[PDB]
């Protein structure tokens, strides 16, 4: 059981050590398309690249590249698209990916400004009456409603394909209170937020995979997917204590590099799963 293993690593202060074992054990696959010089401007960080095997393609014949990975968890029957925070020049690409993959939800785990720098372009409208047109991808985006709570905001958006005049409702789940440094003290607000995304039906097999992002799409984004998958595996298995969080993280790293950036994020993920398991048992 991981609750016991938590006290072990904690009392022995071994988090840096576990985390390094995971670093060394993690898959390494080619990322050739990401490093093409034509794609340099489409990447927020030169050291964070999708693997060729798991990358999302845009359907535009011109240049199909976006910094986005499909994570398929076969036993949990859960998929996720992890992506970087959009750049000023890739906001149209982001929404074209959301349109093509038939996603129902976008989960955002960062503020647009953190530590006095832009972590992300402002890629959605701030006012009902000021909609956004992405000329490069022929899409229109409208704010329908916005529900601001203490720890997170939920927004209702209409995405319209100007080419075919089809429209879809997108839910934007924005966690607003992840601290600039370190991790939340308690995982309660994060778990609440994750249960709210689940309730929406954004994580359901009826729809395309949820799109999850922070700045790089590996740290906070990793914690989100890891917690959701582990909790779902605990519902599904005859013995819930058979779920090894290190095994699940390693399976997820076959699909995108660097998921969980720090030993703090690893500790927080254990804590989120352990606490979440109480609300599930
Ligand atoms: C490469 N990169 C992070 C950027 C591209 C375009 N505008 C601002 C930043």
UniProtKB/Swiss-Prot annotation:
One GO CC term on file: endosome lumen
Consequence of changing residue 49 to A/D: No phosphorylation
The enzyme's E.C. designation: 3.1.3.48
Chain positions with S-nitrosocysteine modification: 214
Compartments, record wording: Endoplasmic reticulum membrane
Chief location bin: endoplasmic reticulum
PTM sites of type Cysteine persulfide: 214
Expressing tissues: Expressed in keratinocytes (at protein level).
Domain Tyrosine-protein phosphatase per the UniProt entry, residue ranges: 2-276
Crosslink (N,N-(cysteine-1,S-diyl)serine (Cys-Ser)) position: 214-215
Chain positions recorded as substrate binding sites: 180, 214-220, 261
MF terms (GO), sorted A to Z: cadherin binding; enzyme binding; ephrin receptor binding; insulin receptor binding; non-membrane spanning protein tyrosine phosphatase activity; protein kinase binding; protein phosphatase 2A binding; protein tyrosine phosphatase activity
Catalyzed chemical reaction(s): O-phospho-L-tyrosyl-[protein] + H2O = L-tyrosyl-[protein] + phosphate
Binding partners and assembly: Interacts with EPHA3 (phosphorylated); dephosphorylates EPHA3 and may regulate its trafficking and function. Interacts with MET. Interacts with NCK1.
Protein name as annotated: Tyrosine-protein phosphatase non-receptor type 1
Native organism: Homo sapiens
């Amino acid at each position: 059981e991981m609750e016991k293993e938590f006290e072990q690593i904690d009392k022995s202060g071994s988090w840096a050590a576990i985390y390094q074992d995971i670093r060394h054990e993690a898959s390494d696959f080619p990322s050739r398309v990401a490093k093409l010089p034509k794609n340099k401007n489409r990447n927020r960080y030169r050291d964070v690249s999708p693997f060729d095997h798991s990358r999302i393609k845009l359907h535009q014949e011109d240049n199909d590249y976006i910094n986005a990975s499909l994570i398929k968890m076969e036993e949990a029957q859960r998929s996720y698209i992890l992506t970087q925070g959009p750049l000023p020049n890739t906001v149209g690409h982001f929404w074209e990916m959301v349109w093509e993959q038939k996603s129902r939800g976008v989960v955002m785990l960062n503020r647009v400004m953190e530590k006095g720098s832009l972590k992300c372009a402002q890629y959605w409208p701030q006012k009902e009456e000021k909609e956004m047109i992405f000329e490069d991808t022929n899409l229109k985006l409208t704010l329908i409603s916005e529900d601001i709570k203490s720890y997170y905001t939920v927004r209702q958006l209409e995405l319209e394909n100007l080419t075919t005049q089809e429209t879809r409702e997108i839910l934007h789940f924005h966690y607003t209170t992840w601290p600039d440094f370190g991790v939340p003290e308690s995982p309660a607000s994060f778990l609440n937020f994750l249960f709210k995304v689940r309730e929406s039906g954004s994580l359901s097999p009826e729809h395309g995979p949820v799109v999850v992002h922070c700045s790089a799409g590996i740290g906070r984004s990793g914690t989100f997917c890891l917690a959701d998958t582990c909790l779902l595996l605990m519902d599904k298995r005859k013995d819930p204590s058979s779920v090894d969080i290190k095994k699940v993280l390693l399976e997820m790293r076959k699909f995108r590099m660097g998921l969980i950036q720090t030993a703090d994020q690893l500790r927080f993920s254990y804590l989120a799963v352990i606490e979440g398991a109480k609300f599930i048992m």
